[PDB]
């Protein structure tokens, strides 16, 4: 059968420091790179941060532009919770977006609390840069970030 999810998760914590590394990316700035081959469906890294109620996102975003931070590191769990990695987080902050991603995100349930965990969509080999579809909500023509993932089937924008 399958491994109990909370064991998978501890194993993730223990090994993810050794499988991934932060380097400069051809996609944008810095990113997360695979350091040893990861099999498909294996946990890669958790999107660690501060778990806040959904009603606190809009207040925090405004105070984030009072500090002039460019990018947003808030990553939504469900309708009522969001992980805020802006000031507190791990290497998963650097995972860039792609339209041909090798990773996907999903929410998991461990002891009542919920975590966002990045899973290997395929077998990923060493030297690859780890990416997932950010799935930003579409916006209008203004406040539109072009996408430089280099994919043959790029959407040309993050949103």
């Amino acid at each position: 059968s399958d491994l109990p999810m909370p064991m998978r998760f501890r194993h993730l914590k223990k090994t993810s420091k050794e499988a991934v590394g932060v380097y400069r990316s051809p996609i944008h700035g810095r990113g997360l790179f695979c350091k040893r081959n990861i099999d498909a469906g294996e946990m890669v890294i958790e999107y660690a941060g501060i778990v806040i109620r959904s009603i606190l996102t809009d207040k925090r975003e405004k105070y984030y532009d009072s500090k002039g931070i460019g990018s947003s590191y808030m990553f939504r769990i469900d309708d009522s919770e969001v992980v805020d990695a802006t000031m507190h987080g791990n290497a998963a902050r650097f995972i860039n977006h792609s339209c041909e991603p090798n990773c996907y995100s999903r929410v998991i349930n461990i002891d009542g609390q919920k975590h966002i965990v990045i899973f290997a969509m395929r077998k990923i080999y060493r030297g690859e840069e780890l990416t997932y579809d950010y799935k930003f909500p579409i916006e209008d023509a203004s406040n539109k970030l072009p996408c430089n993932c280099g994919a043959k089937k790029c959407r040309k924008f993050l949103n």
Binding site: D58, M74, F75, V82, S105, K135, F136, P137
Partner: peptide, 8 residues
């Protein structure tokens, strides 16, 4: 409220 998402 531009948060990354798990699904639409």
């Amino acid at each position: 409220a531009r948060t990354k998402q798990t699904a639409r």
